[PDB]
Design a protein around this ligand. Structure first.
Ligand code: NA
Length: 240
């Protein structure tokens, strides 16, 4: 997250860190949202590589013992069947991870609530992106979980020619684009939390930013629209 602030450690208890085994250690690669005690929602592109993955719930500082973490292996990966890794702009950038164990819930570990199917946010709706992604274009991962306020940019604007044009689909949510605050590499797969009727819900799964940089004016961060995938999510969980 570029232009973020440090999150309070109990603000976003559904945020997870998706990590891969790297030598004798683990490296953060993506975010995700805990949606059942044994299921995480993330981006398909985060699990394109044939790596050994684990999820960390209750994580705050990637570089220090928080006293709250639970570490759990990924047992099964179900990518959306229409995902095509060389065409992110087509959409379908979503995957579910079944965890090897069911995590224990507490103030640091909660299920993300999802929007009702079909919900589309009005332009300029208030949301936060959260994650440990790069803090500058071509920078480094954050140590502590970051948040940035990114108001939505509706389809009509986001798919206009000075924004994303044809690359943004109605199955996506755009947020931000102010040139200061954005998602960045390593935030992929994590949540966009939007406040609706008094309650934050996870409306987005971080999918892409501009090849020209993270915080680029009129290139808002692009997310998979969770509300387009409610039936898919339920179908996967019920069949696994
Ligand atoms: Na930690």
């Amino acid at each position: 997250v570029v232009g973020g602030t440090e999150a309070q450690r109990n603000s976003w208890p559904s945020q997870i860190s998706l990590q891969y085994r790297s030598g004798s250690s683990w490296a953060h690669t993506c975010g995700g949202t805990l949606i059942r005690q044994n299921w995480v929602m993330t981006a398909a592109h985060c699990v394109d590589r044939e790596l050994t993955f684990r999820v960390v719930v209750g994580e705050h500082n990637l570089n220090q013992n928080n006293g709250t973490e639970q570490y759990v292996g990924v047992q099964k990966i179900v990518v959306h069947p229409y995902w095509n890794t060389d065409d992110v702009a087509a959409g379908y950038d979503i995957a579910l991870l079944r965890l090897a164990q069911s995590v224990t819930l507490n103030s640091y570990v909660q299920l993300g609530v999802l929007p009702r199917a079909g919900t589309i946010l009005a332009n300029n709706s208030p949301c936060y992106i959260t994650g440990w992604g790069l803090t500058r274009t071509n920078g480094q991962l954050a140590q502590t979980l970051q948040q940035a306020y990114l108001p939505t940019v509706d389809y009509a604007i986001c798919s206009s020619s000075s924004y994303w044009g044809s690359t943004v689909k109605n199955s996506m949510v755009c947020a931000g684009g102010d040139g200061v605050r954005s998602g960045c590499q390593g935030d992929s797969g994590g949540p966009l939390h939007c406040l609706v009727n008094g309650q934050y819900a996870v409306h987005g799964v971080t999918s892409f930013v501009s090849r020209l940089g993270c915080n680029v004016t009129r290139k808002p961060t692009v997310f998979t629209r969770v509300s387009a995938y409610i039936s898919w999510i339920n179908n996967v969980i019920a069949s696994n």
